[PDB]
Design a protein around this ligand. Structure first.
Ligand code: HEM
Ligand code: HEM
Ligand code: HEM
Ligand code: HEM
Lengths: 142, 136, 136, 142
């Protein structure tokens, strides 16, 4: 669970990368789909699912918007992401094993775009934060 | 495992363009800081520690060995496996964690050149090496 | 993978003494109830569902194939891998979960006869099969 | 996180197997050490580390006592297991990846001893409970 040091580290990092949220979302989803083929099946209803695709570009914004929400509800992710959880579990039926995969792609993306900002001290708090998000999202599965 | 030629080429390219003395120390340091429990294997700040650096460099020279024997990886690491396992007592999960840090550090160095395709071949290569090290 | 003769013997013994029609349905049912998200692959209570039972039985006949080709497992499951992967869209993590339920159900049937040594050879066998199914 | 249904399922199961806690602890630790060799290193200070060993028999009681404690602090595991966490992280330096391994051995043990009681409905709540224990124990690691 996140300490005061972790909360400020994330707010601090986020004030730096937040402006590029759309770009991060787009690149993360693209990587996930290319590197982890088992994830394509959830977006197969889109006609075009390639790095450039406007559908991916479009969904990339929604996902990082999920992160932005989590950042503002960082004191209670369980409660803050309850609905997103219900949605992925019962409506979209996304296998829960994939939350950690996307988190890792986001970390890779943030690292290619902000090599200077993503220090090891920032990495550990963000990683703890993203695990919190994965745990919060898996909440309504069983 | 099976390797396409495109995969063989990417991994090979990645390694010749990599500066081991720079990537090595950064990846191990980052692992010791993000996953603190791995620090115990080095109890004898972290970013400037020469012993951590030396081993960071050795990891890259070891992965290098794997690049030159991509079709015989399991056999290439038998010695190292027994060493980290039986004599050093490194939990097999620690290889997965160190593997992700190498990826993230390499990603930060190559920037936009670390395409999804490049990430894919690199992760598959580390995965095979991790299986061999967490076997014996 | 490498197999000792003691391992080869245990796994072989385990399977000849196993009643597939009983273990099969119990293991799949338990997996669908403990890890609810696997239920989607069967949307077309759970304990009495004949379709779940039929597939439960098929899993055991499939593992049986692996027992008769312990030195060529990866090749023995190529067809099944592509099927569950490309045509059924079963997440690779689902194999690990189903694997633990087979272990727990077999454990409940064999009682004190499911020694640590027996658990070890059985888990290693399922591990190899899981790698092959979550590959293609 | 555990619902009222899960809490009663665990209290119910525990009122059945609690009496055999010592036996479960002994067999679980033995299995873990045999099946997952990487765990022996933490108990190598004992002269005898085999299924029969009195050292294992002795520690088996302490571990299931940890479970019994968790069962009574089931409303707040994080707080209830804080000290056990500090102990494993800083004093014993047990790699955190092993908590799930021991949990799985306990589940196997409970299944060989109480095949009738360990139904799938009991299994899911206990499994959620043991993940809670693993999460609580990993708390002070970083
Ligand atoms: C970083 C964690 C994640 C966050 C914050 C997140 C957030 C969201 C949000 C905000 C929506 C839009 C809700 C709506 O439909 O109105 C959504 C939809 C969806 N998500 Fe996620 N998600 C995450 C991870 C995942 C993963 C790992 C997958 C599967 C590989 C996934 C698959 C989907 C699908 C298929 C949809 C519906 C797509 C569509 O618009 O047609 N999500 N998600
Ligand atoms: C990613 C794969 C890894 C490779 C290829 C690797 C490689 C090596 C090599 C080549 C040696 C020197 C062996 C010798 O002198 O005979 C070594 C030593 C050692 N390794 Fe690793 N290693 C890896 C991962 C790890 C991890 C994850 C840890 C624990 C955080 C670890 C801890 C040690 C220790 C404590 C030593 C001995 C001290 C030293 O020589 O600096 N290694 N390793
Ligand atoms: C432990 C390894 C497994 C084995 C050996 C196995 C084996 C099989 C076999 C032999 C078939 C019949 C193929 C055919 O008719 O051509 C099949 C079908 C299928 N499997 Fe699996 N399977 C396994 C795991 C899983 C898992 C974890 C799921 C998802 C919970 C799953 C879902 C399905 C579905 C939906 C079908 C098609 C329906 C049916 O024939 O009953 N399987 N499997
Ligand atoms: C089911 C989760 C676990 C619980 C509830 C638990 C509980 C305990 C308790 C109550 C103690 C005694 C405290 C004392 O020393 O005064 C202890 C000690 C210890 N635990 Fe754990 N533990 C758990 C998992 C693990 C794991 C997975 C490992 C490593 C494979 C581990 C290794 C140790 C060691 C090495 C000691 C000190 C042994 C000794 O007495 O010399 N524990 N644990």
């Amino acid at each position: 669970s996140l300490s005061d040091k972790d909360k400020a580290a994330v707010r601090a990092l986020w004030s730096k990368i937040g402006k590029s949220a759309d770009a991060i979302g787009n690149d993360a989803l693209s990587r996930m789909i290319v590197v982890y083929p088992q994830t394509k099946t959830y977006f197969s209803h889109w006609p075009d699912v390639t790095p450039g695709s406007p559908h991916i570009k479009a969904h990339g914004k929604k996902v990082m918007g999920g992160i932005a929400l989590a950042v503002s509800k960082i004191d209670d992710l369980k409660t803050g992401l309850m609905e997103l959880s219900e949605q992925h579990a019962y409506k979209l039926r996304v296998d829960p094993a994939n939350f950690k995969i996307l988190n890792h792609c986001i970390l890779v993306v943030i690292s290619t775009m902000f090599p200077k900002e993503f220090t090891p001290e920032a990495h550990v708090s963000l990683d703890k934060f993203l695990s919190g998000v994965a745990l919060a999202l898996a909440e309504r599965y069983r | 495992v099976e390797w396409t030629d495109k995969e063989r080429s990417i991994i090979s390219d990645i390694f010749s363009h990599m500066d081991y003395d720079d990537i090595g120390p950064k990846a191990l340091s980052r692992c010791l800081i993000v996953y603190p429990w791995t620090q115990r294997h080095f109890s004898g700040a972290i970013i400037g520690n020469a012993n951590v650096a030396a081993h960071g460099i050795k990891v890259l020279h070891g992965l290098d060995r794997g690049v030159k024997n991509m079709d015989n990886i399991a056999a290439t690491y038998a010695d190292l496996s027994t060493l980290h396992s039986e004599k050093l007592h490194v939990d097999p999960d620690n290889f997965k964690l160190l593997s992700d840090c190498i990826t993230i550090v390499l990603a930060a160095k190559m920037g936009h050149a670390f395409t999804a395709e490049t990430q894919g071949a690199f992760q598959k290569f580390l995965a095979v090496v991790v299986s061999a090290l967490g076997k014996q």
